[PDB]
Design an enzyme around this catalytic site. Structure first.
Site, PDB file in Angstrom:
ATOM      1  N   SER B 201       0.852  -1.180   0.000  1.00 36.92           N
ATOM      2  CA  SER B 201       0.000   0.000   0.000  1.00 36.92           C
ATOM      3  C   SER B 201       0.898   1.244   0.000  1.00 36.92           C
ATOM      4  CB  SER B 201      -0.921  -0.016   1.224  1.00 36.92           C
ATOM      5  OG  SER B 201      -2.118   0.692   0.960  1.00 36.92           O
ATOM      6  N   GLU B 334      -8.558  -5.769  -4.344  1.00 37.85           N
ATOM      7  CA  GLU B 334      -7.938  -4.698  -3.574  1.00 37.85           C
ATOM      8  C   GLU B 334      -8.944  -3.847  -2.808  1.00 37.85           C
ATOM      9  OE1 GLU B 334      -4.906  -4.110  -2.790  1.00 37.85           O
ATOM     10  OE2 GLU B 334      -3.969  -5.626  -4.048  1.00 37.85           O
ATOM     11  N   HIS B 447      -7.538  -6.336   0.212  1.00 40.44           N
ATOM     12  CA  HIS B 447      -6.342  -5.552   0.445  1.00 40.44           C
ATOM     13  C   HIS B 447      -5.649  -6.081   1.707  1.00 40.44           C
ATOM     14  CE1 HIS B 447      -3.795  -2.059  -0.133  1.00 40.44           C
ATOM     15  NE2 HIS B 447      -3.915  -1.756   1.149  1.00 40.44           N
TER      16      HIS B 447
HETATM   17  P1  LIG Z   1      -2.820   1.754   2.179  1.00 46.39           P
HETATM   18  O1  LIG Z   1      -1.410   2.393   2.625  1.00 46.39           O
HETATM   19  O2  LIG Z   1      -3.700   2.865   1.386  1.00 46.39           O
HETATM   20  C1  LIG Z   1      -3.069   3.218   0.153  1.00 46.39           C
HETATM   21  C2  LIG Z   1      -3.924   4.265  -0.578  1.00 46.39           C
HETATM   22  N1  LIG Z   1      -3.722   1.241   3.671  1.00 46.39           N
HETATM   23  C3  LIG Z   1      -5.027   0.656   3.297  1.00 46.39           C
HETATM   24  C4  LIG Z   1      -2.920   0.221   4.394  1.00 46.39           C
END
Ligand SMILES: *[P@@](=O)(OCC)N(C)C
Ligand SMILES: OC[C@H]1O[C@@](CO)(O[C@H]2O[C@H](CO)[C@@H](O)[C@H](O)[C@H]2O)[C@@H](O)[C@@H]1O
Ligand SMILES: OC[C@H]1O[C@@](CO)(O[C@H]2O[C@H](CO)[C@@H](O)[C@H](O)[C@H]2O)[C@@H](O)[C@@H]1O
Ligand SMILES: OC[C@H]1O[C@@](CO)(O[C@H]2O[C@H](CO)[C@@H](O)[C@H](O)[C@H]2O)[C@@H](O)[C@@H]1O
Ligand SMILES: CC(=O)N[C@H]1[C@H]([C@H](O)[C@H](O)CO)O[C@@](O)(C(=O)O)C[C@@H]1O
Ligand SMILES: CC(=O)N[C@H]1[C@H]([C@H](O)[C@H](O)CO)O[C@@](O)(C(=O)O)C[C@@H]1O
Ligand SMILES: CC(=O)N[C@H]1[C@H]([C@H](O)[C@H](O)CO)O[C@@](O)(C(=O)O)C[C@@H]1O
Ligand SMILES: *[C@@H]1O[C@H](CO)[C@@H](O)[C@H](O)[C@H]1NC(C)=O
Ligand SMILES: *[C@@H]1O[C@H](CO)[C@@H](O)[C@H](O)[C@H]1NC(C)=O
Ligand SMILES: *[C@@H]1O[C@H](CO)[C@@H](O)[C@H](O)[C@H]1NC(C)=O
Ligand SMILES: *[P@@](=O)(OCC)N(C)C
Ligand SMILES: *[P@@](=O)(OCC)N(C)C
Lengths: 531, 532, 531
Positions: B201, B334, B447
Site C-alpha cells: 500500500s 484490492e 487488500h
Molecule cells: P494503504 O497504505 O492505502 C493506500 C492508498 N492502507 C489501506 C494500508
C-alpha cells in the site's frame, strides 16, 4: 511571456509591464528574498543567506513590510507612494525582500547602472513596495532596486554588548547590497556600478554605509536625501543599556543580564513586540515627561561591526572609502509632514518666544539643545520679528536646520575635504500630489522631492507641464550621477561640484547654481553646540 | 543463552532471544533502535539527522512508540494487519524514528545473510513497524528482517511547496533508515551488499518512489511493491500544494502571511495540538456532502526537487533511474472490503445502481481522481454489463481497485521492464483464515491479504490449515529467493515467469500457476479514458 | 587608572582594591564570562565558548548565582562568606562566570601560581561571589579564581542516556579550567601551575576532576576540603531514569521517552523549573516516606564522558593522571551547619539507641547504610556510654565519618598507592565568625577551615591574634602546595607526606603532625558495608 531569471539561489518568475509610450517592456520582480527569514532564534542576529529553492519561484506579489505600527506605516506609505493607487501591505517579521525594476533586455546581456533605494521612516516604519520603480527605470534606463530592512525593536534593539550589538536593520541593508553584487548581472544590471540612495532614515542609512568599512566594495555612488549620519535623532550616542531595559520591562521581561533580556524578547511573539512598540509611543513628541528621557525611536548604535566609532570620529579620519556623494535637503524639511506625524502642538498656527522655548525644550530628543542654550537659539531665529505667525515658521526653520541642513552641509564638507567628488542641492517645490491636509504655503516639504525622483508625474494623474519637466530633469540628474558620479549632462542646467566655493543646485520651478548653502547656520550651530 | 549484544557505529545494543518451533538457532530480536535524531522542536519538518552516539549498552527490548497519528485508526489497522497472535498496543510520539531487527544468524559467528527492509502502509497517515513481527520470515528463510518507521501525516508530509518546507520528510526518513542499514546491518549478520526493500500500500508506493529517487540510488538492490506504486495517484500530489498547506495552518490556528511564517507557527504547536488538527482535517474519510474535487486534498508525496525532481510519470519514461530487480503485485479484490470499511463507504445496502454509482465515483474523487465528465463512460464500462444491482455493487468495487492499484501497477511494471530491468508480477488471490469475521465470505484477495503469507502469520497465529501454511511457505521462499537473487524461482516452487514482452505473471493462491497479460484490457481502457 | 586586560574574547576592565599591609593593589575582575549563556536550546548540553565582544567589557559587577533555592542559597552564602558584609545576589540561568583576583603588577610579565576555587553547596546551591579572594591573593601572591557552574536540575538533570547524559555542572568546571589555560597569563597567572580546590560538593568536584580524563592537562595540584568522589550522597550509582521521570512529572511533562522529557523540560521557563526544584524538597531530610526513595539532591552520574566508570573502579585502576593531591576533613563535619540546613530532628539535643536507629535509617540517602546494618553501626558508636546527650554527639561523629572521614582516607590512600604525592589534614578550630545559633562546644564544624583559607580575619572584624596567626599559616600551606605540590615552607610546622606511615597534619590552636587518621573507623566501615 513571463520573464524568468536564474539567481544564485534559484529561478525567479516576474512579469512585464509597459509604461505608456515606451516600447521596451520593463521586467518587474516582486518579493525576491535576499536572506533567511529572521524568525525565532534568528531575531536580533545578523541576517543569514537565504536557503536555495528548487523550481521556479513566483516573484509576483508585494512582500510584507517589516513589523511596524500599522497605522503610522500605512499613513506614511499613502503620503510617499509615487504610484496611482496605494497598495495595502501585510505585516510580518518575514520581510527581508527586495523589488526589482529592470528595462534591460533579459534575453540579451546588459550592464545598466543599478540604483538601490532605501526607504525612510525613522527606522521605525516604511517599506520598499511603497516606491514603484517603473518610471525611473523606463525613463533613464537603469535598474531600480527597492529594499527592505528590519525596523524598530526588530532591527535596532541593542543591549550595547555582544548579546545584542544592534544595527540589525543596517546589516540587512548590507546583505541586500551584497545580494545585488551576486545577482544583478542576471537582471541586466552592472554590479560594477551600484548607486545607493535613500531619504530621511534611508538617507541616514546611506550616510552610515558610506562611513562603514563593511560596505566598502558594495556601492560606487551615494545619494542622501534629507538625512545623514549627523542627524542626531537617528544615532544613539552613549550608553544604550537603559533604553534596552525600558523595552525589556515594557515587554514583561527581566533585566537581570543582557543575555536574559535578549533570550526573553526572542521568546515573545511578533505581536507581543508590536504592542510593546505601541506602548513605547515612538515617533511622537512627548509633552508631559522630562524631554531628556523621551525616546522618539530606536536607531543606529556604535556596535563595533558596522561602526567602530561615532560618525563624527569617522569623518575626520578620512578613512571611509570615498565615492561620488550627492547630499541634499528640502527648503522646509520640518514644514508639515514631520510635525504632523509627531503631533506637534501647533494647532493655532502661531507662536511666541516663551512658547517656542518650551516647545524647543520639549523636542530635545530631536534637536539635543541644552536647556541653557534655548534662549540663544530661539532668540537667533524668532527674535528678528514680532509677527507670531512668522515666529512659528521660523521656529520650523530652526528645527529643520538642526536636524537636516547643518548636518548635511557638515557631512558634505567632510566628504569633500576627504578628496571625494561631492554634490549638494536644495529642493524647493510643492508637488501636486501633496496631501490635501498640507497647508498650501508649504513649499519643499520633507519627502517632496520623492515625487520627482520616482517620476510620480508619470504614474499619478494631474501633473502640470512644469511638474512633469521637473521630474524628467531630476531623474536625469539622478541617473546621470548613477552612471558617472556626476549629474551634469546635455540639456540640463549646470550643477557645480560642491568644492571649496560650495556651489550647489537649487531645484524647483527655477533651477540654477547657487553657493554656500546654509553657511551662516552651520557657523551659528557649531559655535552654539561647542558651548 | 544470554541476551545478544551487538556493537553498531553509534553504540552497543542489547536484544533478546526468541525461538520458533522447528528451528534450533534462536532468533535475535532488537526492538526500537534509533536510526536518526528525534525530529522534535525545530527539527520538525526538516530532513532526518544522524542519531547521537550512546556511551554504554542501549536496551533495545521494548517496542518503540509509533509516529503520532489517529490513535483509534492506527490501532484498528494494526489489529487487522498484525501477523502476531495478539496485537501489541502502542504509544504515540514524535520521537518515533526507530527500526526493529529480526536476525536468525548466530551472532557469535560471521554471517552475511540477505536483508529485507519492510515499509508499512497506512496511507502515509497511520501505521507502525511493530505491527509486523519478522520472527517467522527470518527463521524460515534465513534472512535478516528489518521493519522501519517514518514520520506520518502532517509531521512527515507537511509541504508549503517551496524551500521553507519542501515536504516528503517521511520518505527522507526511509532513505535515512536504509543508510543506517548499510552502515550497521553487518553487525546483525546481514549482507549490506544485498538489501531488499518491500512494503505494501503506502509502503509499496514508498518502495516505488524510492526506486525512482536519486537519493536512494545505492541503498538497496531489489525492490518489492505489494498493492501500491508511484502511480497510485491518491498518494502523489501534483500541482499547487500551497492551498492545502494553508488549510492546515488555519485549522491549527496559525497565520498564513507567508510560508516561512506558516512553518514557524506549526513548529511551535505541540504534539497534541497537531494531533487535534489532524483529526479536525478528517483525513482517511470520504466526504459525502461537499465538493469532491476539494474533498480533502490528502497529505502525501510531492515533487519537492530533492527526493523527486519530476512526476513519477516523467521519471519512468526517463529510463534514467538506476535499475534493480523489481517485483510488483496486486491482490484479487484490492477494494474488496478492508478499505471501504475503513473509509466508512456508503455501501451499507450491498446494492448499487448506475445512478448512485456515478455519485459515489464522483464523491470518491480523491481516491480515483476521475473527471466528472468521465464518470459515465467508466461506470458504463463496468456496471452496464448486468442488471443485478448487487452485481453492479461488486463490479464497482473492482472499478475502484483497478483505478487505484490494478492499472497503475501494470504500467509501472511495463515501464520498469521497458527500462531493461528484471520485472516480476503476481496477483494474489486467497482468503486468509485470520480475516476479521465482519468480512463477507465472498471476498478473496482483499487488500492486505498477502501480508499473512509474506510474514508467516500461519506460524504465529492459531488454527491455520495445511493449505494456508503451505501457501505461506511458498510465498516466503519466493520472496527470500528474490531478495537473494533478484529472481523468485528456486527448487520446490512453481515456475514464476519474468514479466517481459509476453507479460507473464504469477497467480498466487490455493492453486498457484503462471498466466499472462494481467489487467491488459483494463489498462488500455483507463489509459484511453484519462487521455480524454 | 582602572586595569584593562586583553583576553581571547576581548578586553575586560576591572578595578583596584588595596589591602592594608600591601603596597601593590590587587586587580579584581568580576563576572567574566567563560562560556556562552546556557539558555534555551543550550539547556542540558555541554557549555559552548563565549562569543567575543567588541569594545571593553566592565568586569566590575557581581554576576548572578545559578538558579537555585534563593533562601537556602543566601543562607549558605552568609554562613560561608569571608568578607565583612555578605553580598546579595540575583538568580539566573546566565551564570557561567568567574571572578579573578590577581596581585600581579599587570604592567610587567608575571607567572604566579593560579588557584581555582570551586564552591560547595551540594550541587544545589552556592555561588563564587561568596568567596573574596582578596586576602589570599595579596597575602600569598597567587592569582585567585572563583568559578561558577550550573546547579541542580540545570547542572545535573540526567536521563541516563545520550539525550541528557548529565554532569553539566562538572563540564562547566572543565570549561572554566580550559578558559584559565587560555587566558590566565593575561592576568599575570601561570597556566603551567594551576591548583583546583573546593570544599564539600566543591571538594567532590575536585576529586571527580582528578579522576576524569576530560580535565587531563587542566590542573597540576588538587585540594579536596571535606568532600571527595567517594562521598556517596553526591554520586549517583544505578538507574537514574527514576529520578529523571520524577522531575519531569513534577514539572508537568510526559515521560513517553527520554527525548520527549528533555524537550519538554528544555521549554520550561527558569521560574517553572525553580518551582519544580522547590517542590522536590532537595537538601532536606525526608522523614515521612521510605528512606531508600528520598532524593536529597541531584548530582554526579556515570555519563560515559566525564566519568567512564564509578569513582571506585577508577581509583583501583591507577590510570588517572597523578597530581599532588591534598585531602582534608574537619573535626566535626556534622557538628552543626549540615544538620541545621537539612533540618535534622535533633531538636531534643539528646538521643537513644531507638531513635538513633530510625534516624540513621531515614538518613539513608546520606550514609547509605542498609537497614539491616543499622544495629552494628549504632552500637559501635552509641553503645559505649549511656549518656543520651553523648549518644547524640556520637551520632554526629557517625554521620560525619561515613560522609567525610572514611571516604577521604580511602581516596587519599588510593591516590598514594597510585604513586602520587598525597597530603592530609584534620582541621580542629572554632572560628569566631561562627553563627550565634551554633553551639559553642562545636569545634571544626563543616566549612570552618574556609575562614582560614580565605583570610577571613583580614576582611571581617573581631579576629584575635591567634585566629589571625592561624589563617596566615593555613594560607602559606595552601599557597606553598600550589607552587610546589608540597605544603612545607620555612617557618611552618612540618607537614608529613601521607605515605605508608599515613602521617597527617592536625591544624588548629596547636598545629602538629599525627598518624593514621580515622584508620580504625575506616576498618570498621569497610568491613560492615562489605555485607
Ligand atoms: P494503504 O497504505 O492505502 C493506500 C492508498 N492502507 C489501506 C494500508
Ligand atoms: O494640524 C492642525 C492645523 O494647524 C495648522 C494651523 O491652524 O497648522 C499648524 O500645524 C501643522 C502640523 O499639522 C504645521 O505644519 C503648520 O506649520 C502649523 O501652522 C493648520 O494649517 C492645520 O490644519
Ligand atoms: O459483514 C459486514 C456487512 O457490511 C456490509 C454493509 O456495510 O458490506 C458492504 O460494505 C463492505 C465494506 O464496508 C463491502 O466490502 C461489502 O461488499 C458491502 O456489501 C454488508 O453487506 C456486510 O454483510
Ligand atoms: O533546632 C534544634 C536545636 O537542637 C539543639 C539542642 O537543643 O542542637 C542540636 O540540633 C542542631 C540542629 O540545628 C545541631 O546543629 C546541633 O549540633 C545539635 O546538638 C539546639 O542547639 C538547636 O537549636
Ligand atoms: C502566494 C503568495 O502570496 N506568496 C508568493 C511568495 C511571496 O509572497 C512573494 O511573492 C515573494 O516570495 O512568492 C512565491 O513565489 C515563493 O516564495 O515561492 C510564492 C507565492 O507566489
Ligand atoms: C517508551 C520507549 O519506547 N522508549 C524506551 C527506550 C527506547 O524506545 C528504546 O531504545 C526502544 O524502544 O529505551 C528504553 O526502553 C530502555 O532502554 O530502557 C526506555 C524507554 O522506555
Ligand atoms: C548587565 C549589567 O548591568 N551588569 C554588568 C555586566 C556584567 O558583565 C555581568 O553582570 C557580570 O557581572 O556587563 C558589563 O560587565 C559589561 O559588559 O559592560 C557591565 C554591566 O554593568
Ligand atoms: C504564479 O505563482 C503561483 C503560486 O503562487 C503559481 O501557481 C502560478 O502558476 C504562477 N504563475 C505563473 C508562473 O504564470
Ligand atoms: C533494559 O535496560 C536495563 C538497563 O538499561 C537492563 O537492566 C535490562 O536488562 C534491559 N532489558 C532487559 C529487560 O533485559
Ligand atoms: C565601563 O567602565 C566605565 C568606567 O571606566 C564606565 O563609565 C562604564 O559605564 C562601564 N560600562 C558600563 C557598564 O556602561
Ligand atoms: P524620516 O525617516 O524621519 C527621520 C527622523 N520619515 C519622516 C520618513
Ligand atoms: P556540602 O556541599 O555537602 C556535601 C555533601 N554543603 C553542606 C555546603
Amino acid at each position: 511571456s513571463p520573464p524568468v531569471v536564474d539567481t544564485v539561489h534559484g529561478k525567479v518568475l516576474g512579469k512585464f509591464v509597459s509604461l505608456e509610450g515606451f516600447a521596451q517592456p520593463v521586467a518587474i520582480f516582486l518579493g525576491i528574498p535576499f536572506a533567511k527569514p529572521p524568525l525565532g532564534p534568528l531575531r536580533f542576529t545578523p541576517p543569514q543567506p537565504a536557503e536555495p529553492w528548487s523550481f521556479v519561484k513566483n516573484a509576483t506579489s508585494y512582500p510584507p513590510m517589516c513589523t511596524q505600527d500599522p497605522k503610522a506605516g500605512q499613513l506614511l506609505s499613502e503620503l510617499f507612494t509615487n504610484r496611482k493607487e496605494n497598495i495595502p501591505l501585510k505585516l510580518s517579521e518575514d520581510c527581508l525582500y527586495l523589488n526589482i525594476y529592470t528595462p534591460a533586455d533579459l534575453t540579451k546581456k546588459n550592464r545598466l547602472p543599478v540604483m538601490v533605494w532605501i526607504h525612510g521612516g525613522g527606522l521605525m516604519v516604511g517599506a520598499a513596495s511603497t516606491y514603484d520603480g517603473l518610471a525611473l527605470a523606463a525613463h533613464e534606463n537603469v535598474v531600480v532596486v527597492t529594499i527592505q530592512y528590519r525596523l524598530g525593536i526588530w532591527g535596532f534593539f541593542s543591549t550595547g554588548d555582544e548579546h545584542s550589538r544592534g544595527n540589525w536593520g543596517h546589516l540587512d541593508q548590507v546583505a541586500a547590497l551584497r545580494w545585488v553584487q551576486d545577482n544583478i548581472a542576471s537582471f541586466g544590471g552592472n554590479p560594477g556600478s551600484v548607486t545607493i540612495f535613500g531619504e530621511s532614515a534611508g538617507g541616514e542609512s546611506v550616510s552610515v554605509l558610506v562611513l562603514s568599512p563593511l560596505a566598502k566594495n558594495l556601492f560606487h555612488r551615494a545619494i542622501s536625501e534629507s538625512g545623514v549620519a549627523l542627524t542626531s535623532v537617528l544615532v544613539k550616542k552613549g550608553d544604550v543599556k537603559p533604553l534596552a531595559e525600558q523595552i525589556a520591562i515594557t515587554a514583561g521581561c527581566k533585566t537581570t543580564t543582557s543575555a536574559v533580556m535578549v533570550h526573553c524578547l526572542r521568546q515573545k511573539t511578533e505581536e507581543e513586540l508590536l504592542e510593546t512598540t505601541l506602548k513605547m509611543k515612538f515617533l511622537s513628541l512627548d509633552l508631559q515627561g522630562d524631554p531628556r528621557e523621551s525616546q522618539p525611536l530606536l536607531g543606529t548604535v556604535i556596535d563595533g561591526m558596522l561602526l567602530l566609532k561615532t560618525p563624527e570620529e569617522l569623518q575626520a579620519e578620512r578613512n571611509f572609502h570615498t565615492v561620488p556623494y550627492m547630499v541634499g535637503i528640502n527648503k522646509q524639511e520640518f514644514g508639515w509632514l514631520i510635525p504632523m506625524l509627531m503631533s506637534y502642538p501647533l494647532s493655532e498656527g502661531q507662536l511666541d518666544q516663551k512658547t517656542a522655548m518650551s516647545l524647543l525644550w520639549k523636542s530635545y530628543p530631536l534637536v539635543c539643545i541644552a536647556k541653557e542654550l534655548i534662549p540663544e537659539a530661539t532668540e537667533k531665529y524668532l527674535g528678528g520679528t514680532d509677527d507670531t505667525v512668522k515666529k512659528k515658521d521660523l521656529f520650523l526653520d530652526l528645527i529643520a536646520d538642526v536636524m537636516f541642513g547643518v548636518p548635511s552641509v557638515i557631512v558634505a564638507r567632510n566628504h569633500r575635504d576627504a578628496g571625494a567628488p561631492t554634490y549638494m542641492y536644495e529642493f524647493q517645490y510643492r508637488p501636486s500630489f501633496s496631501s490635501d491636509m498640507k497647508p498650501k504655503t508649504v513649499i519643499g516639504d520633507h519627502g517632496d522631492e520623492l515625487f520627482s525622483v520616482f517620476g510620480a508625474p508619470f504614474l499619478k494623474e494631474g501633473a502640470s507641464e512644469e511638474e512633469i519637466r521637473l521630474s524628467k530633469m531630476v531623474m536625469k540628474f539622478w541617473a546621470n550621477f548613477a552612471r558617472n558620479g556626476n549629474p551634469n549632462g546635455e540639456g540640463l542646467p549646470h550643477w557645480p561640484e560642491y568644492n571649496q566655493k560650495e556651489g550647489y543646485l537649487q531645484i524647483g520651478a527655477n533651477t540654477q547654481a547657487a553657493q554656500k548653502l546654509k553657511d551662516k547656520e552651520v557657523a551659528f550651530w557649531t559655535n552654539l553646540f561647542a558651548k
